[PDB]
Amino acid sequence: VKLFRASEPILSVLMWGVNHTINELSNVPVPVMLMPDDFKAYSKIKVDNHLFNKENLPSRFKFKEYCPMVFRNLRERFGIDDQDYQNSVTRSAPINRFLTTYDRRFVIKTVSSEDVAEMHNILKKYHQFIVECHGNTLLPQFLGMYRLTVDGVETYMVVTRNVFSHRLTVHRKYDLKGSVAREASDKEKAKDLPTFKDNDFLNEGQKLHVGEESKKNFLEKLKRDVEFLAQLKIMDYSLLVGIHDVDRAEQFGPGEFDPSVDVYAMKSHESSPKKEVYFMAIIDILTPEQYSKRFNEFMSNILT
Amino acid sequence: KVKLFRASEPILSVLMWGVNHTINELSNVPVPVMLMPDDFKAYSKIKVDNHLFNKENLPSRFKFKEYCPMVFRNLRERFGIDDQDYQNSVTRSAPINRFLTTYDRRFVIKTVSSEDVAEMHNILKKYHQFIVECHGNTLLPQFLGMYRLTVDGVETYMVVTRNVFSHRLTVHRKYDLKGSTAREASDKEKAKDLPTFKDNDFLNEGQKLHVGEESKKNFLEKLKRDVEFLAQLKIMDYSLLVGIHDVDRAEQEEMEVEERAEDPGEFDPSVDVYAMKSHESSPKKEVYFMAIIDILTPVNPEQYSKRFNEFMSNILT
Ligand SMILES: Nc1nc2c(ncn2[C@@H]2O[C@H](COP(=O)(O)O)[C@@H](O)[C@H]2O)c(=O)[nH]1
Ligand SMILES: Nc1nc2c(ncn2[C@@H]2O[C@H](COP(=O)(O)O)[C@@H](O)[C@H]2O)c(=O)[nH]1
Ligand SMILES: Nc1nc2c(ncn2[C@@H]2O[C@H](COP(=O)(O)O)[C@@H](O)[C@H]2O)c(=O)[nH]1
Ligand SMILES: Nc1nc2c(ncn2[C@@H]2O[C@H](COP(=O)(O)O)[C@@H](O)[C@H]2O)c(=O)[nH]1
Ligand SMILES: Nc1nc2c(ncn2[C@@H]2O[C@H](COP(=O)(O)O)[C@@H](O)[C@H]2O)c(=O)[nH]1
Questions:
Q1: B312 with B180: CB under 8 angstroms?
Q2: A50, B69: Cβ pair inside 8 Å?
Q3: Is domain A1-162 in CATH 3.10.450.120, yes or no?
Q4: What's the CATH code, domain A163-303?
């Protein structure tokens, strides 16, 4: 029995909706190809329950899923099974707008109306790029996109594969742009999990040691990705970098992970210094050349 | 395990979709210790607007309303029907024949009027209680679900019952009996393969049903408290549906179907709930199906129940 019990009705509706749309899709045949109309398609469901099932869910709400054939195909190309995705969302309330599913596998971001417009704008090309690069990219992996109507209010959400591991504690993070100059404010330096920027990183002189093995794949990925973004005329995106220090965590194995689940994770080299696991991906792509070459060079000068 | 909701009419597709949907939702809703008054005024409602999606069998746009779902879930449970079975009976393949049967012939789906839905509501509390205290042992219709579908802005009301007839055993003759003081079948009806015969038809044939005394007593005790119950409410003009299954004739028919394709009379009393074998000293081996039908649509109730009762009691031996 899934109750869809959550801290807030919006979360309940999200759970119910992912459950309903995934189950509904299990009845829809996997097509031979996507069609143009699948990129303009949606499912809308409206619920009005009088005196029934009101313990966790509201009596009246709406749930809208954008382009469900497209995002279902994207899930497949990212190696994600529909039942696991459904399970991660519905087995237990997602947790702390920015949420994670209870198992930390998937991120759920509340976004604006124009974000959803922009997603419709890039979705065809993004899909075609995911096809051509065989799912091997550092771009956000867009798994689903929904609009919830609760208490008359519309809330838009986009679901991604988590950049960080769902298991390994991240010990310090960086939002890097390659840009100007930006750092962490005194108020930002106070949180246990601080978000550092380019200059903090550079001035710290901290490098990341993945060898020449991982460096190859990574840079080969990064260039194709930013070339794609530039071809779309998009900018202001970042490279999110997470660092998990193994010894500290230690103080069911240290540094042990399943690469097919922690897709962005990289082991520190042996000849390198301290022992770490790194997590690196491109975030916030929903908004030119200069930006791409610059970002690329900045991120390339971080791997030794 | 893919379910397509393929059907000849959008109405059937939506019915299959809605039963599938409501039963799956109910699986995520714990079973209460008891029912509460609100469950009798309760309903669920779902409105679907699909755009450029999932349009092969379902309409893009439709509505589905289930009346008092907690109550009907409970009534199913008291009638010895598992929710997954009910759902599979409705959704694995399209119901057939508005009068529908599920593809496996276990459940009957009747299209009713808005007034019929109204009357179900009026009587639902008392019907439930009566089902509680007679332990699901009744000749009354066994109500398993009530729905409203909206397709093309048009509303259709539907009530689901257990089939009076066997889901496997062929019916060879049927009567609708009231006990009214002239009720016969038209020359038109008589020209159907399976005519609905009536009182005077039953009487004139000298037809009897030989069930033997234990079965007869059980049946008559049921009939008695059932028709008293109906008399207590406003209810009049209901009927006893009677189906007769000829065992030998069926055996032969089976043999003939095999011969065609090439180029007993037992049954589960927990599934064919209205079925009685003939007395081991009957002129021929038969199986009978007997139950009360048409109790919703409502010389007065008391009188009617008394008469109906007398007549039905002189039907069998
Ligand atoms: N755990 C986790 N945090 C993320 C992820 N993406 C962005 N964040 C972080 O979440 C915060 C808000 O995200 P943003 O406003 O960029 O969407 C920032 O601190 C950002 O670094 C992710 O995929 N996983
Ligand atoms: N649509 C709707 N009709 C109702 C409701 N309650 C009673 N009715 C209908 O209103 C009429 C009178 O109901 P009463 O209150 O007299 O028993 C009947 O036709 C009955 O079916 C309700 O909650 N909704
Ligand atoms: N007594 C009663 N009648 C209802 C209720 N809901 C609907 N009805 C009756 O059922 C019929 C159809 O209702 P509708 O669901 O289309 O609003 C109408 O005759 C309406 O009055 C209810 O909760 N109680
Ligand atoms: N097979 C079957 N036929 C029924 C059942 N109830 C009613 N019928 C038949 O269906 C036709 C119309 O139903 P009614 O007008 O009673 O709703 C009549 O021929 C009637 O005898 C049932 O439970 N099973
Ligand atoms: N009562 C009865 N009729 C039979 C039997 N075998 C054949 N008949 C009938 O005799 C006719 C010829 O049957 P056929 O043998 O050509 O299938 C048909 O009317 C058929 O129903 C039987 O074993 N018992």
A1: no
A2: no
A3: no
A4: 3.30.810.10
